[model samples]
Target: MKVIFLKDVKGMGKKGEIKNVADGYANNFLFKQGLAIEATPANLKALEAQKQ
Candidate 1:
């Protein structure tokens, strides 16, 4: 699955960056921790807005 990071992660990309990751990891860890959100069209557009 693809995700947009909400914050920095060790050994991972910085905040607001999109990354491809395992679905299990993304759903279980990252989403649980509020570190990222699924890279859906709406979320991607929101992340882009945050960048500017």
Candidate 2:
């Protein structure tokens, strides 16, 4: 799954980076807390909109 990095996680991408990570790692770890967000189309669009 795609996710946006909120902070600099070792062995992972840096903050503000978009990356494809394992589902378990993303869901069970990142998304479970507030460190990252799932990159769904709606959410991706929202991020893009925010960028503009």
Candidate 3:
């Protein structure tokens, strides 16, 4: 699945960046810690808004 980070995850991800990751990690780790969310079209558009 693809996820967009809400926080910097050292070697894993940076805030507001979208990436493809294993479902295990995405759910069990990143989402569990509220570090990121699924990158749906709506979420992606919201993410893009941050740059403007």
Query: TM-score for each prediction?
Result: 0.82, 0.72, 0.81
| 1 against 2, candidate with superior lDDT | 1
Name the best candidate (by lDDT).
3
lDDT string for model 3 (1-52, tens) is 8999999999999997889999999999999999999999998888789878
TM-score for candidate 2, residues paired by index? 0.72
Worst 10 residues of 2 by lDDT: 5-14
Candidate 1's TM-score: 0.82
For model 1, the local distance difference test gives 0.90
Question: Mind sharing the TM-score for model 3?
Answer: 0.81
Please report how far candidate 1 places residue 47 from its true position, in Å: 3.8
Instruction: Please tell me which model should have the higher lDDT, number 1 or number 3.
Output: 3
Clashes of each: 0, 0, 0
List model 1 lDDT by residue over 1-52, tens digit each. 9998889998987887899999999989999999999999998887779878
